[PDB]
């Protein structure tokens, strides 16, 4: 029964971040990891995804080579080549990662962890038990797959975790979901050559994002050659001779339902949401609160319903982004160990980029979210649509949409949403302005950087 | 002797902008243009330059095709193809441009204009004379070429104006200058295949920019295969059998001068600065003030040393950017016609992007400029250098540098300078923040957008 100042459950983005900051503050932390250190983030998340996104962008620009005065470019494309490099890059960083964690004198407890049936702050990792007045739950989540009970054959399809294990380009791809992980994957596969289909329960993807984004993204997916199967759900799946057959039902309002058999699918990817890893923590044994989906409940300070126990990251279910986990984990360390009874993460105005094609950028409230918080009368929105001049010479095209959500007489910028070339690297700066409480005037008093797309944001009329 | 409310001299970026805003305010404007409406901006500036920049970027990314899992791409590249399209795009916009100017009921006086020898507000355009209580000088500037007196054979070399008239890719290129127009041109030519040399009077380019940028840009030019001829000047030029021979003198401190003959140059481009078009306005005939280089002097309100006469744009010599001309021209219209005795352009924190490879972004003071304004003790700077993960799988590389200049206890962000992938579209947002008076804290309280380069700006330690 060893004892530490800080005991972290889950050695990934949030856990490590928080633990490391603690030891930096003096605390003697001990993080527990059951698998690879770095969680979803490193291994099957962010980077490997960005690399794959880059490869896809490259592929697109190459459909432009000729347009740009060059002789046509082949396009065979070898997945195994990029995969190899991706794995290299990962472990390459992963090595540096480890080095740091190592020099942070943080003990790494190996094995699955769960809270036992004791009252004093303790969890049991493979027999042995550990205690600490402060215990953090940063076990993250996982890709959600349907039960054979619900959809027979469901285990035939993979998830984003499988996506990064793929060694070849699926000839025929089917992705089920409407979130960013789904949109992102369909984007890459399609760009890289797979005959891709995206199956969504409704008529547009990213429905939680602003209406303009949802509508525009769906249209771009289509223009890019991604078959968007609207108002469709997978009723059953099974292995055929040439791969997989997917039976889906399409229920378009104003139309009668219809069954369709999708044949020769080289692989199905489930991208229907993430599930928090809490089912084996045996939380109840301490009364740690959770919602019905399993997320650990917390207050503005990442405090669980039980003293001396906290939670940050995907496990909490709000804002599933590695930076949010990082920030939350650190602020906590500062509160618990630097004694800053105010150290806490502001979840408002967290900027997000969805790596679609072109990328999506967003921060602040959606128009609809604004209307509810301020009132229809107190909300004006500006927006523009245009074709990046990069496509001025291209047969192939993609537009750019921008929307600015303003509130009150002062027209405070409470929301910024956009999709288009560059937007992935264009948002960070504006997010900063938005968190300072920028106004439409603040944007308009800023001289435009011509010629770029970014300048359109400070010239919205 | 017709009379108008607003008479504009020069129908380009600033003139048109200002005039158009005036008529929008009621004023009956009449702009005078001696050549093509749109000035340097449209015809031989911004867009045609960006197009050419894009083509070059494309060319670079194509040196990566194989790295990114694709079979090698040829690379012949046909300049005439892009040129044709560029010309198309230009006139295509140029058409829209005209449409607007037309529906703005602004009379366009054709012909060269200059102030006569009268006291009442009047200029003479091809015989006829025109008057107005408010007259704007927006004649812009022009590329500077040396005299045969100074450098014999100088007329053999072209300027940026010639660059956009080129129908082929010069096999061997030599560009003289250290400014952005010089750096930009060398970048494109080199990227597109020309064996390029950049001749600079000193050891680095963009010496007016921050030290980090100057140093980094020069190194990138070199890595990209651009021969940077340091401490060299063109002493003489002449046409040989295989093109042109350039005689230059290299004067490296700590070393003895040396003459070098550069042979087989397919074309020399002078990019040594811009000259304001005022020498034929016969300004003196009214006592309109100018500096020794010819720029028209003005106050914070674009007022010349003579009532009823103003000037905005390159002709004034400060901040030679189409947006600055636009902004200045409009604010003036608002002052003179909306009667806003405060309507004036803030020249502080004007953001600028230099389209090098990778692009350069900047706003605010340079570290050295900060030290002088606040004092060494009151200035701390943050900076980071790294390789965009886009190059994680590329043999070819380019780094990314970022520098944040802070002043006082509060660490107010007074300067932001960077070079790297995306920076061209990454700056606008941060400029906005910077003009609001952002602090290092304002940046740091903003959640990072991972994984991007932009996030490095809000995580500088
Ligand atoms: C395909 C994909 C792409 C993504 N792209 C992005 C992106 O571009 N930008 C972005 O910001 N976010 C992205 N994310 C999300 C980001 O990776 C996560 O938000 C972040 O990793 C969550 O942090 P976490 O601390 O919860 O860690 P993980 O979710 O990183 O959790 C940490 C560790 O907990 C361990 N663990 C679980 N249970 C136990 C236990 N009982 N005992 C011990 N250890 C345990 C796990 O094994 C894991 O290694 C992406 C995710 C996916 C799946
Ligand atoms: C290669 C190159 C690239 C550039 N790239 C960029 C860039 O990326 N971003 C940026 O912001 N800026 C860029 N610029 C600069 C930008 O184009 C200028 O700052 C802007 O055009 C200046 O505005 P202006 O109003 O002075 O017009 P011009 O300088 O546009 O002036 C307007 C007109 O005055 C007319 N005129 C002159 N004398 C007379 C007379 N006596 N009577 C009547 N008419 C007269 C001219 O014929 C001209 O058409 C670039 C310039 C060059 C050369
Ligand atoms: C070649 C290409 C894809 C597979 P994918 C794959 C999977 C994907 C990534 C990592 C691990 N497993 C998996 C399956 C695949 C599938 C797709 C069509 C027909 C049969 N199987 C089926 C069961 C779950 C794992 C197998 C061989
Ligand atoms: C093919 C390629 C370049 C020229 P460039 C060119 C020029 C460039 C653009 C537009 C107009 N003129 C010009 C010259 C050129 C030059 C370069 C090397 C040897 C001789 N001439 C020489 C005089 C000024 C105009 C002529 C033929
Ligand atoms: Au991550
Ligand atoms: Au598969
Ligand atoms: Au321009
Ligand atoms: Au030439
Ligand atoms: Cl590991
Ligand atoms: Cl014209
Ligand atoms: K990480
Ligand atoms: K223009």
UniProtKB/Swiss-Prot annotation, chains A, B:
Molecular function (GO) terms listed?
electron transfer activity; flavin adenine dinucleotide binding; glutathione-disulfide reductase (NADPH) activity; NADP binding
Q: EC?
A: 1.8.1.7
Question: What's one Pfam family the UniProt record gives for this protein?
Answer: Pyr_redox_dim
Which residues are noted in the entry as glutathione-binding?
Answer: 13, 20, 97, 330
Mind telling me which PANTHER family this protein's record contains?
GLUTATHIONE REDUCTASE (PTHR42737), GLUTATHIONE REDUCTASE, MITOCHONDRIAL (PTHR42737:SF5)
Something else known: The active site is a redox-active disulfide bond.
This chain belongs to which protein, by name? Glutathione reductase, mitochondrial
Organism this protein belongs to: Homo sapiens (Human)
Tell me the gene name: GSR
């Amino acid at each position: 029964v060893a004892s530490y100042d800080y005991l972290v459950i889950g050695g990934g983005s949030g856990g490590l971040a928080s633990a490391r900051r603690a030891a930096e503050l003096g605390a003697r932390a001990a993080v527990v990891e059951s698998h690879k250190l770095g969680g979803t983030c490193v291994n099957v998340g962010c980077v490997p995804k960005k690399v794959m996104w880059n490869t896809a962008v490259h592929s697109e620009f190459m459909h432009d080579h000729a347009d740009y005065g060059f002789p046509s470019c082949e396009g065979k494309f070898n997945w195994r080549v990029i995969k190899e490099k991706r794995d290299a890059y990962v472990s390459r960083l992963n090595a540096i990662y480890q080095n740091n964690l190592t020099k942070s004198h943080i003990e790494i407890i190996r094995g699955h962890a769960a809270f036992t049936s004791d009252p004093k702050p303790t969890i049991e990792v493979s027999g042995k038990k550990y205690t600490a007045p402060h215990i953090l739950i940063a076990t993250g989540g996982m890709p959600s797959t349907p039960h054979e009970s619900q959809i027979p054959g469901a285990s035939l399809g993979i998830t984003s975790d499988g996506f990064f294990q793929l060694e070849e380009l699926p000839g025929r791809s089917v992705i089920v979901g409407a979130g960013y992980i789904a949109v992102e994957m369909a984007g890459i596969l399609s760009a890289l050559g797979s005959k891709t289909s995206l199956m969504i329960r409704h008529d547009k993807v990213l429905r939680s994002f602003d209406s303009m984004i949802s509508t525009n993204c769906t249209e771009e997916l289509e223009n890019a050659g991604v078959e968007v199967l609207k108002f469709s759900q997978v009723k059953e799946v099974k292995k055929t001779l040439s791969g997989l057959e997917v039976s889906m039902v399409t229920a378009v309002p104003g139309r009668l339902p219809v069954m369709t058999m999708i044949p020769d699918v080289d692989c199905l990817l489930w991208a229907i949401g993430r599930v928090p890893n809490t089912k084996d923590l045996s939380l109840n044994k301490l009364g740690i609160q959770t919602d019905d989906k399993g997320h650990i409940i917390v207050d503005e300070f990442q405090n669980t319903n039980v003293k001396g126990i906290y939670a940050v990251g995907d496990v909490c279910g709000k804002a599933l982004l590695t930076p949010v986990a990082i920030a939350a984990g650190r602020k906590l360390a500062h509160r618990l160990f630097e004694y800053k009874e105010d150290s806490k993460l502001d979840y408002n105005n967290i900027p997000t980029v969805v790596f679609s094609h072109p990328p999506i950028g967003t921060v602040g409230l959606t128009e609809d979210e604004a209307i509810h918080k301020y009132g229809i009368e107190n909300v004006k929105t500006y927006s523009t649509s245009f074709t990046p001049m990069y496509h001025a010479v291209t047969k192939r095209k993609t537009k750019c949409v921008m929307k600015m959500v303003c509130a009150n007489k002062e027209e405070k910028v409470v929301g910024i949403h956009m999709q288009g070339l560059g937007c992935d690297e264009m948002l960070q700066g504006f997010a900063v302005a938005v968190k300072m409480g920028a106004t439409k005037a603040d944007f308009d008093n800023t001289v435009a950087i011509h010629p770029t797309s970014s300048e359109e944001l400070v010239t919205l009329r």
